[PDB]
Structure 1
Amino acid sequence: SMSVKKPKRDDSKDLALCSMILTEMETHEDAWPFLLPVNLKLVPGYKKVIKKPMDFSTIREKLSSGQYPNLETFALDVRLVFDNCETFNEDDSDIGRAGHNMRKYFEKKWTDTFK
């Protein structure tokens, strides 16, 4: 509360460490469904159904331009990429399986880097 603060967790490396995680996601072999924005002209249904599209290139630009206020807002966009994927793709599809694999990969890196 006012003039009563928990001890200061060092956040000075968060930007660099989120960038490293994102590099690792970018270079995973199952990243290909997620590298670029879904083409809203060429994929029927996507625009109406997915209210907040997100992809790795869009996260990378937001990261690079100071549009994440803290590490939690970064994790929310990453998870949005996988939640979108599950909304639109059957579990038993190459893209559906890619999304589950990447989410697993991300969540382990996140825990090991920050928890």
Structure 2
Amino acid sequence: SMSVKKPKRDDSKDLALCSMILTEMETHEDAWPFLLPVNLKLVPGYKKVIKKPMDFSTIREKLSSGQYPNLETFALDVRLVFDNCETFNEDDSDIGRAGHNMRKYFEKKWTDTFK
């Protein structure tokens, strides 16, 4: 409350650490469905169904240009990429499996880097 603060958690490295995580996601072999925005002209249904499209390149640009206020807003966009993927793709598809693999990969790096 006013003039009553919890001890200040050091957030000075968060930008660099989220960048490193994102590099590792970018270079994973199963990243390929996620590297670029889904082409809304060429993928029937995507535009209407997926209200907030997100992809690694778009997160990378947001990150590089100070559009994440804190590390939680960064994790929300990463999770959105996987949530969108589950919304649109069957679990038993290459892309569906890719999404589950990447989300697992991300959540471990997240916990190990910050928790």
**CA distance in 2: counterparts of 1:47 and 1:86, whole angstroms:** 15
Per-residue CA deviation, residues 71-112 of structure 1 (Å, 9 max, x unaligned), is 000000000000000000000000000000000000000000
**1:100 counterpart residue number:** 100
Give the % identical residues: 100
**CA distance in 1: counterparts of 2:102 and 2:67, whole angstroms:** 23
SS at match of 2:41: coil
Per-residue CA deviation, residues 29-69 of structure 1 (Å, 9 max, x unaligned), is 00000000000000000000000000000000000000000
Residue segments in structure 1 that go unaligned for 5+ positions in a row: none
Q: C-alpha displacement at 1:8, in angstroms? A: 0.2
Scaled by the length of structure 1, what TM-score is found? Answer: 1.00
Aligned length: 115
Per-residue CA deviation, residues 4-50 of structure 1 (Å, 9 max, x unaligned), is 00000000000000000000000000000000000000000000000
> Where do 4+ consecutive residues of structure 1 move more than 6 Å?
none
Residue segments in structure 2 that go unaligned for 5+ positions in a row: none
CA RMSD of aligned residues (A): 0.1
